[PDB]
Design a protein around this ligand. Structure first.
Ligand SMILES: Nc1ncnc2c1ncn2[C@@H]1O[C@H](COP(=O)(O)OP(=O)(O)OP(O)(O)=S)[C@@H](O)[C@H]1O
Ligand SMILES: Nc1ncnc2c1ncn2[C@@H]1O[C@H](COP(=O)(O)OP(=O)(O)OP(O)(O)=S)[C@@H](O)[C@H]1O
Ligand SMILES: [Mg+2]
Ligand SMILES: [Mg+2]
Lengths: 87, 228, 187, 319, 87, 228, 319, 228
């Protein structure tokens, strides 16, 4: 799969691309979530590493019960973008 | 009554379908599962001479087995079954008809839409494999002009597309193509040369196995597709 | 009636063990089972007034402890948290959290009531299931039967439809077997 | 003339009209129901009634019995996703060969938490319409989704006329006398039964329930008229206890409404909204939404509801 | 397929109408949540789009463990009504 | 010693009464239930040449079955039983005499107040029905000048008023009336023809089943009368 | 005079004491054990050792050997109901034709699920009290049901009395030196043995285990022996990682334990209990319970563990 | 293949040894316990003409016994085994070889340190006694110039000093003392006349049973002492 597009979108803090690409990952959630959690660590502020991990872990926690998976990924994307300590 | 060994075996087999049986004054004993999925009936040689509803048919048959073959059953003064013998005398509680679930009248199975036949050995093999191979659903479909009793696992194969067992019963000469999905829990027929004659109409269908001792009418599952 | 006039007493444990009457042995062993009232009283006393009580052999029931501690709004937030997340916690962990959260007090449990009060929801549930009425009508029927109809008389027959599958909806756990025996004898 | 199951101890499910004729109904409603029963078929019907208690569940069961149909009595509460796809589908598909029609009576298919159950039943009825007929039974019609309304023909109870009112009152008084005689209950005054029936005429289930509750004394004393009782749908006890902030009663009352949490939270958010300050309406929705949000992760729903009660009592501004 | 009534009532900030119409739109929750997100994004100020994302994401992720889905949707409607502005 | 198949079968049957049997030198084997309610005795064809107490008779006989009949059972050096086969030697631990309840002396049964007979088939059918019907207790009563064994389910009806099973043994020559009650848990007699001869003086009674091989004695329950 | 087992791959079992005299303990406890052995008959005894590692299994076996009793050692966790009904009864009802008292030594009997077996063994003691004597060893006396303490005589011996403390300090140092000499490890550092004795003194089992661990490479007996330890622990590595707040290790090891989360989560709760503070323990239990509730709801199950670790590290104020 | 009765019995025995098996092309079937304690191999008269790794050998044999003896077992399109009777056609999955533990190649047994013969009756008696006497460990040491198998109950006494059952195999020729301890849970050999070839070097040893059809190899317990 591709994760560079989502990471760059988070870096530039776009909002249209996140929504557009969210349905492209909703088909398989766990794989994409794990991959994103792995990649984001190498490009996050040491203090913001904990925040990113907590956000991704909470979202992973509440999947399965989420009514709309695609909106579930979208919400993840805005949550990451709004308060990501990019380094 | 007399309830000869053959009738006792038939009732013992029936007890599998329904825990209790509502016997009637005649030579015809019939039963149906509580959920109604499976119906069983047969003409018993021994003559039943009083309407008695037995709540525990398995236990009644077990008690009857330990008595002499010529154990003259009779109605007790209280209203229960009195299995009299040469010396002994066993009393069984004849539960009220309300608590015993039995069909109101014999099922008049319509003209079979696709008659077939299942050999005794084939049926015995089909049951043993289902027990041991995890099969819990069989679809009596048509394949290359031959009727095949496929076997699936609805628990895991929800779509019922991965066949686990196959059994070419015979060749179907008709043009209609059908996939009759029968649950395995409803396949309670006793061993014997059966002649299953299927029937389907719209969303309602049935499959009837008509042996030389008893006739079992099973209800096709909700997913049975066909073009009749 | 003891054919033999033996001077050996066989004190109700020798008879159970020597005869290999494993049912009798189990009954004799349960004869040393502390009645649930004092076990629960000790557990709730340790939880409510901080005390050095340890549950290793005690038959610790999460539901009983929670619904005997929930009678008091002071210790409701702890009961609420252990209701939301307590399931899946080890009984020792549940007890430790309740010990650390439930602030203090005495609270005078009154175990005689919370045993019956804990079956009220089950009674309503299976009474609405048997009569096919909504839970409000089920509680109305329960109240009516308490006065007229001899609610125990209804429950005598109602016990037959408390299936192992039905109890799953009442509560989600493997300790639900407690009310299986509880309703296994309702007369 | 009066049916008796003899197996029910409730006196309301024991003496209930087994046939449509025995039901006390207005002339127009009874004639329409007789026409439906005489047609020999039971089209999908949403039995409706403005005044609750006029005997609509009993009328549906009487329709099914009169037609001789293989009625499958199922509550709206338990008509969930699996039930619609499971037992209902099995009943509708499995074709018994007795010629009896299949009818699925569905009580109270208008409660709060039944948003999606109605749609799933609509889909099922679309699939299985030709085999089994569905007889809904709702108090308020608007509680039933609009698409489901078109499929089944709606019938409305109530609206008795003056002559109909008098005839029904006399019929119910005679029925009460017969029930009391059959139940070994001595009525002190004949006028007592007439007064009791007049107190709640439009609905008879309430009258039968009041008589059953009072039967403890064994005599229909004049004190029965003093039994105010309480509307089944109303939850006024919870609201009064919340206003008084008596947590000792909210905890003991939580099990009563914990059997059906979804409907109760719906009703609470519905009713507590019109009797609290607008500033506290937002907080009420926050609390009820948060409590509803976590139901499903909560092991015991009774404690969930008790916590919700304590929170609402301690954090509610009552107008 | 059309949710213009929900958007209009939310803009008017009439909590009574939102709750009244929630039961009929609560039969389908995933689809309605997606549609509400899209229309609110197209019809909301840039600053409040993040607030809408947070609100709708929380509410849908907690779905499935919601005892009463209609009350859940009414809660979503109230949160959106009192917590966001409209462009 | 040497334990013939007959003696081993008799000991195996006894093992159902008392889990362990205190064997004694000679030709007499006797065992009592720990409750003391059941007593069994028999004259074996073998010769027990040493006094040994076995706390697990079922296991001892299971071991004896494996070794050939030639196997010679001899006390080991440390007191344990030692089944010595032709090529394999098995050591069995002799129980502590305190931890094995055995009668001190044989029960000398007084002259029977009433002497009857029970056929092997009748007794086997009674034992099987007891399990089938849940017959907790029985009663060797007289009905119309005959000896009848009426089975009751004491757990359900405590007054012992409903006969769930009635067996007629024979005509009672005497003229006394009695309601001897024998619990089914104490009916451990092996299949065969038994000349059961009852006896009850005052409030204490006992029923003895004088068989061809063993002579079981059963304590009559407290509700038996034989008031004469 | 050290008794070497000579048949084990572990020093602790290899050099376990063979008698009470060669067992080094507080003077009062050793005198009590000597009197118990001198009386000849070993009664029912519960060996209570509040301080772990002091050795209660060793003392029980030493008593049984010293009194010549026919010991039957059974591990407490292995003393299930079936074990009590079977092998225990078979041993207690076997002819003791040697004059040796039959003594059952149920070791570590204060476990979690050992209640239906503890009361069952109490009934056993009621039956075979004159055939075999039971010597139960429990770390937590509160973990042994009350009847088992009312029948058996509870004995506690983990409290050195100052001067006895120093006497047994010298005794343990001499014994460790002798065992090292017999093993084939030279005492390179004289201060190292004393330092290791002081570091965990009333943990003789742990000290012997560490001596075995550090003796494998060579004689050593200096350096890391008295400097900290090297025990990895089942979850000790994760506990240390969380304490240090390191994030790389947590994510690295999350997939290692993600295979069986339930056992790991339970063990993590159990271990973190002892290293936290009341507010910290409340928060830790809330975190672990919340995370476990969503096991079947987690998208993968490895990022879930990572999130649990991050939460604990951020919130867990270790003490 | 056309697996016959004897090959099916051998595979059932191996499934007893190992929950699953890994059939390989040719005429050789071998399997090893999950923990490697016991290794079993045998030559068969049927040709395994394709490599499959059945994860549940016992269930596969059970399903195979439900068809004709000439069931032309083969491999399906997905690689899963496809038993094909005259009419029926079962489908048994072939698990990935990684999951099923199997030996890399046939185990080459070192030269026979000692040679002894254990008869079929003696072996069956040993197994049955071990099940009965609670024996769980057997020592094959030599006593008074003869090789005997002693049964020790480790649970009651870890020190193997109290012998529960002694079996004399045959005369011992060598002049070396050895006491090999073989766990009884590793003695999965089927009944027959075996040809024990004991072998042990240093602290590691292994005993092989040269069966008529199979060659079972068992790993001696570490507690074994000897002069090899
Ligand atoms: N028209 C009627 N004639 C006779 N009995 C009636 C009538 N209506 C109700 N009842 C009595 O009420 C009981 C059953 O009424 P139901 O139809 O179940 O009440 P209901 O219509 O469901 O009220 P709601 O709307 O569900 S609260 C029985 O005891 C009947 O005897
Ligand atoms: N007081 C002691 N004197 C001599 N050796 C001891 C002593 N305490 C422990 N040991 C050693 O500890 C090992 C055996 O420890 P045990 O006490 O039997 O095990 P244990 O059951 O874990 O005891 P714990 O951990 O205190 S509950 C042997 O190597 C003994 O030599
Ligand atoms: Mg109704
Ligand atoms: Mg220990």
């Amino acid at each position: 799969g591709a994760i560079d597009d989502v990471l760059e979108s988070l870096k530039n803090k776009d909002v249209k691309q996140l929504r557009a690409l969210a349905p492209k990952y909703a088909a398989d959630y766990s794989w994409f979530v794990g991959k994103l959690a792995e990649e984001i660590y190498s490009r996050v502020t040491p203090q913001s590493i904990i925040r990113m991990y907590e956000i991704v872990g909470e979202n992973n926690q509440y999947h399965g019960i989420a009514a709309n998976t695609e909106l579930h990924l979208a919400y993840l994307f805005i949550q990451l973008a709004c308060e990501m300590q990019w380094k | 009554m007399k309830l000869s060994k053959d009738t006792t075996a038939l009732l013992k087999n029936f007890a599998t379908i329904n825990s209790g049986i509502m016997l009637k004054s005649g030579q015809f004993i019939m039963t149906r599962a509580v959920n109604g999925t499976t119906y069983a009936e047969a003409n018993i040689s021994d003559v039943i001479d009083f309407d008695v509803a037995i709540y525990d048919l398995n236990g009644f048959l077990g008690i009857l087995s330990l008595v002499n073959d010529d154990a003259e059953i009779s109605q007790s003064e209280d209203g229960n079954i009195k299995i009299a013998d040469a010396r002994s005398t066993i009393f069984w509680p004849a539960a009220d008809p309300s608590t015993v679930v039995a069909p109101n009248k014999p099922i008049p199975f319509p003209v079979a839409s696709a008659v077939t036949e299942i050999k005794a050995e084939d049926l015995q093999q089909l049951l043993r494999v289902s027990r041991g191979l995890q099969i819990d659903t069989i679809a009596i479909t048509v394949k290359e002009g031959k009727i095949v009793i496929n076997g699936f696992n609805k628990v895991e194969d929800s779509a019922l597309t991965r066949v686990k067992y196959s059994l070419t019963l015979g060749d179907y000469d008709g043009e209609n193509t059908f996939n009759f999905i029968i649950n395995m829990a409803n396949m309670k027929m006793q061993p014997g040369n059966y002649k299953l004659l299927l029937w389907a109409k719209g969303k309602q269908g049935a499959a009837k196995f008509e042996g030389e001792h008893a006739n079992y009418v099973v209800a096709l599952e909700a997913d049975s597709t066909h073009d009749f | 009636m003891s054919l033999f006039k033996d001077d050996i007493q066989l004190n109700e444990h020798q008879v159970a063990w020597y005869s290999k009457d494993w049912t009798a042995v189990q009954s004799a062993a349960d004869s040393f089972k502390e009645k649930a009232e004092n076990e629960f009283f000790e557990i709730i006393g340790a939880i409510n007034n901080k005390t050095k009580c340890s549950i290793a052999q005690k038959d610790y029931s999460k539901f009983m402890v929670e619904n005997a501690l929930s009678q008091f709004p002071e210790c409701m937030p702890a009961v609420y948290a252990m209701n939301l997340i307590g399931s899946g916690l080890s009984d020792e962990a549940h007890f430790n959290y309740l010990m650390a959260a439930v602030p203090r007090g005495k609270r005078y449990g009154k175990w005689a009531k919370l045993v019956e009060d804990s079956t009220e929801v089950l009674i309503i549930k299976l009474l609405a299931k048997r009569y096919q009425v909504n839970t409000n009508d089920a509680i109305n029927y329960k109240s009516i039967l308490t006065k007229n109809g001899k609610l125990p008389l209804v429950l005598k027959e109602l016990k037959g439809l408390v299936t192992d599958d039905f109890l799953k909806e009442v509560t989600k756990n493997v300790k639900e077997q407690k009310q299986l025996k509880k309703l296994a004898l309702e007369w």
